[PDB]
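Crash report, auto-generated. Payload:
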Amino acid sequence: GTSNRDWWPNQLDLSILHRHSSLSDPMGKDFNYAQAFEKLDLAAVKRDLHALMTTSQDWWPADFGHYGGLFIRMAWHSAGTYRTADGRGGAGEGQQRFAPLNSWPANANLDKARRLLWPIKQKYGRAISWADLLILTGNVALESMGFKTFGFAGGRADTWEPEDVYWGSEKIWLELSGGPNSRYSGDRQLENPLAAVQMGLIYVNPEGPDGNPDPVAAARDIRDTFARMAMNDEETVALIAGGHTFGKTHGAGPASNVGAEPEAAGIEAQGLGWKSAYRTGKGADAITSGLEVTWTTTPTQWSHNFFENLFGYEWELTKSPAGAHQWVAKGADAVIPDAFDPSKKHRPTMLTTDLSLRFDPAYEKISRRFHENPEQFADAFARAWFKLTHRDMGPRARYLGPEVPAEVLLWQDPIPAVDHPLIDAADAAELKAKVLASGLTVSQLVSTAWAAASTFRGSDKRGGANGARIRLAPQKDWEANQPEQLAAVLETLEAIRTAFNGAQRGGKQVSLADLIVLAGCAGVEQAAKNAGHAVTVPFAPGRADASQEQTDVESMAVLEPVADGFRNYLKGKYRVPAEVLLVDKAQLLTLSAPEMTVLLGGLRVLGANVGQSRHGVFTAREQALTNDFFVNLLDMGTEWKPTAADADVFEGRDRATGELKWTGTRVDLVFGSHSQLRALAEVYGSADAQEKFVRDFVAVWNKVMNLDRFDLA
Amino acid sequence: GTSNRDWWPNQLDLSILHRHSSLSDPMGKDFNYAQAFEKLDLAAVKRDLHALMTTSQDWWPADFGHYGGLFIRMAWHSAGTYRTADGRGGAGEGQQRFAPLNSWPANANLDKARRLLWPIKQKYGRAISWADLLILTGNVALESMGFKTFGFAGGRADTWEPEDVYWGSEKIWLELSGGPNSRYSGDRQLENPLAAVQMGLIYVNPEGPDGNPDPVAAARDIRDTFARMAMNDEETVALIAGGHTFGKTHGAGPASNVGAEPEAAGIEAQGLGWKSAYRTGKGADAITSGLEVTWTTTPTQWSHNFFENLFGYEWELTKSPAGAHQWVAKGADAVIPDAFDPSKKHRPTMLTTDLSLRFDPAYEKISRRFHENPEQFADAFARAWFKLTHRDMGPRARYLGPEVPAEVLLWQDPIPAVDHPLIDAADAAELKAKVLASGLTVSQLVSTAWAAASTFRGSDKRGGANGARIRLAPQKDWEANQPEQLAAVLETLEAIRTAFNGAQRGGKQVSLADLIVLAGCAGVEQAAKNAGHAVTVPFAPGRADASQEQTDVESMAVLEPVADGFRNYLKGKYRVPAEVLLVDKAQLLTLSAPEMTVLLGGLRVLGANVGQSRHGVFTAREQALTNDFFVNLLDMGTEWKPTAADADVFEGRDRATGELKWTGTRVDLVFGSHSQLRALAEVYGSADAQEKFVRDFVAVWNKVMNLDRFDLA
Ligand code: HEM
Ligand code: HEM
Ligand SMILES: NNC(=O)c1ccncc1
Ligand SMILES: NNC(=O)c1ccncc1
Ligand SMILES: NNC(=O)c1ccncc1
Ligand SMILES: NNC(=O)c1ccncc1
Ligand SMILES: [Cl-]
Ligand SMILES: [Cl-]
Ligand code: NA
Ligand code: NA
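Recovered output after restart:
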């Protein structure tokens, strides 16, 4: 069947905004996963998972009699798709169970691991999500094998369809770099927002870069990709050596024995894939990656034997039975147990990427410290495993259950507890009138609140106005935030706050985070009044102010908005057209196409553009909240043409006289071009729509102001 | 960006069930278009439209000073995508304004037409849909030019994204037959459900079949495609000759001067396309189809000149200025006016497809009668135009406004008005107890009600249980309906009804349509009781019984369910896999994927399969409403393989013993294979889900029973 994507492969795709509707969700619209989870008997779940670890099923027999290694790799892969650049990927939505992740080559035979867990999922039903179960299972594995975890939080609600994520442009699984859709350019520079070296891998190629078995060069790829997953050198060494303390790889025969991935298999495979014609197809004959390595002498128990081996032997390049490059210990005795035959033993083996931990000079120092002090190793691995598996969960307010750790970690962008009474509606009214009396304009108040709140991204639930981090490094100096204007606004609001707080009793006070948002609300109310409309913008207090010491400046860098179509901003010239970047930002904000449209049209006429650009400001009453953007955009009396200076800027001229009326960007004009967006613009540009436009704008403004407010969930 | 449809281009696409969510719709979920329309001043809209007819805009000047012909073509195209095979296409959702129809080659320059209507649309806002406006505009064009219409109904609610319709598999616009994705096989047999001869055309090629200018051969294509749009020979002649009484074609220069269609044009084109480099690009220089034909001596007035010309001259094959085949009248004077220059006249011209009306022997007889009796032509064209433009609107209950014709037409599948008191809840309880005391089984009650109600399709709103057409020809004889079983059920119900109605006073009675549905509800209640659940199923009375003379047997043929996965039925072996047909049927039923899933799993255990097939009947308590389908389907204790006898039937065997436990079709096993469907099955196969399953099943049952109940809207 030929589709619109086939005929117009470069048109903008809006379906990405319209996923996760109540149509596709089988749970009631009233279902609240947090409340279901809070009544789960988590201890009972963990006992069943503990019993599972050593209950081998004949359709996928457990190596060494223990599924622990399999499940730790399963949880690691669930979390390991995360990219700091956009927050997309991670374990938080249980997306391993859907396309394309369920069928990535690097996920081969994790379909078996998930199926092992069905009986437990079936038993507990809606009170534990797949997403939470995958993580919990990896924790129980580690515990059952003698490793003390740092903690676990529930609260990952299941999703019911695949996410639309850019995983790369290659058309061939595992394609080596330098092809027509190369994710690499220059000196091995990986394109943003990607965090893997090849399409269908998690981080790196276990044989080495593009299959070249050089541990030194492999270390560069490890460092790059792990950094793009928010992990530093210590964390990376802890994780890889920690994971590879357990279990084994599977490469018993040639890879050409392995059939179709789950999404391509026949109907009879019932959602499983990679069916293998090599010998029994499973167990001792398993083929997963094509590598055949077993790292330690006790693969089913926590130990420090990974480093004892890595440092205690010299390593020789060899090939598995499938032909993959891997390494074996020179001169060693057969000390590693076999997974099925207790009368066979093997020499120690390693992957190229394991040897990176010894042959890269910065890794080596950490690996040596962890070898000499395995208690330091254990603690670093526990902390890193917690971070790995929770990095996309969002604020601590979303963490559920009895195993949540009490230690607050810097990477959580923590927000202090509120320890005083909050402002009420009459105080809010009083503050809004003081803000308006100070002389701050609609444009300044709207712009500042939009800057503070619009750092939120629903992908990993980081960012938003809670914390008042806009006043801190590095937000206060971002070019999109207009640092000089911002500093002057913030100083006026801080003086209002100090005067309000100093006049109170009872210990009531207002945070600056709350006041920035409330001042934005006042701005919107005043804009509506300027157009002849009386509205109240809803406001919910309770935000708190974070300190600079509770804010990791480097980790905050990925939230910098380099493209923000809502403020008509583009920090430089990109390969991706600006309208595509708009839709991308809208998806991170959790906005539908109607919400995006109304929000943008309102922000234009309120003066939210960076630098006070007149691009898209299609009104003669700036700072009044009207539907003028839409009415003027859609006026066929105006003709539009790209400028000589810039193909990305357009002049709108009177068709009859040639007089210049307006200028706009691709982000402004896409609303009069794209057939679905123009149909939305028409609704808000109609003669009956001014009241609807105001009401819808206020509702979307309030939604953005509240995006991080999980303390009110 | 590589997507899941790139990697797995044959996987089933569920997004078609999850279109038209409240996420993409800008109107509130409380918006009710019928109520808005009811307040429209329709008379005022018609005055504005009359004014527009001769208000020429310089960017697309009106031929002859009058846009009437352009608008008639616009409305005809809006309606003309309709296919009786699936009811998809038609004017009823205003889809001409979205991709791909906004950019079909046959819709060239109708983007100009729609843009001329923007000021009117803007003025009246939500109180007139685009969908209604396009048709109303065609009506007003006809009236402005002297032709009295049969009437008009409002009520086509706008839609807000493109529909997912199969328009064909060709990858080239207008591709000629016999390519790699040919829509034709055998002796020029057009594949179902298509109703056009080439990708991007409405019905046929105006130059003749595959561009060969043979009017007799063209007539065969006209007849076949018009029949696939629900039109007979008389209606077809009346429509083509009536349309081509007005206006002209556009082919002033070579087609290579015409640029990108709207979905491919640059953003500065603001939603318009086909910009032409030929002279001024417009008006006298316009290029639309490439043909250059003006049919009558008065193109802006209703006349009898079409047939006078067709019969009064002999025709010679010639070429337009763009190179297209067309016909000119031999020996004629220059009697046809020019559209822009009062000192130019032209000879009569015709399309190949106009000459079909004279040289096909069956059309010739009609054309002659219309020539000799122009009042019969007029009346035929008025009735046909009404039909063309309302064929997809559904029951008369959905027709709004003051110009609805009072005459009831056969093609509307009319249902008599109810003129007596309806049954109340006490009566309903009494009838259900009688049905249950008669000996009818769960399986019979469920199957008969399902058969009655599941003929509905939302694409054109035909079908459903209202009218009790299941008792009439041809529904009573469909193999999917099990004619012998059905006849025995219906005779028992008719005896129940006759005894109930004979005992009443005050004129109360129950229709057979209502009793079929009510008996189906009793069967569901009984099934729930069989499983230990106390469930009352909602029922709404008010259906009426249509007669045989109100039921066109030929028009009913397209509702015959040749694939109904809900009853595990397939009438023959088709090239489209059966799970694709299941999703297609779900879409016509208006079901989401969770609704499809719950409905199918329950029907399987209630005994709704055709012929009492055991395929997918994964329970040992048939006729009890349980979630057994899901629990057994997902049991990993069973392994599945296609049978040797048949690749489309599967055997499920105990993994450990090899013993056969179940059989299933592709439709059954898809629920355990497709990763999204299996995630839904898991929710209903969980240990906490038995009550959920029963309740969701009842809700979806009721939804299907009420699909055609526009009398209660
Ligand atoms: C440079 C990063 C990494 C590379 C290239 C990598 C590579 C692989 C490969 C190729 C396999 C074999 C798959 C198979 O044949 O069954 C595997 C197994 C495994 N990996 Fe990793 N790994 C990495 C990091 C991690 C991390 C961070 C963890 C967890 C903390 C992890 C835990 C495991 C475990 C437990 C297994 C054994 C699975 C089993 O017993 O079935 N790995 N690794
Ligand atoms: C066999 C069926 C038909 C064929 C092949 C066909 C073909 C066409 C073609 C090629 C054009 C020229 C487009 C252009 O260059 O501007 C056209 C114009 C037109 N057709 Fe048809 N036609 C069909 C049936 C209909 C029907 C059923 C109606 C309406 C009842 C209709 C009404 C019109 C009108 C009014 C125009 C003139 C447009 C103008 O003045 O801009 N046609 N037809
Ligand atoms: N822990 N990572 C893996 O299992 C893997 C990595 C690369 N190819 C196959 C499997
Ligand atoms: N691909 N996923 C995201 O963009 C996203 C997910 C959940 N909420 C907002 C954005
Ligand atoms: N009325 N049908 C059309 O205008 C058409 C058919 C084929 N090519 C262009 C236009
Ligand atoms: N393609 N459009 C349809 O199939 C449809 C439209 C409205 N309700 C059900 C189905
Ligand atoms: Cl994601
Ligand atoms: Cl459609
Ligand atoms: Na994420
Ligand atoms: Na339709």
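Post-recovery validation: The two ends of chain B are 44 Å apart (CA to CA).
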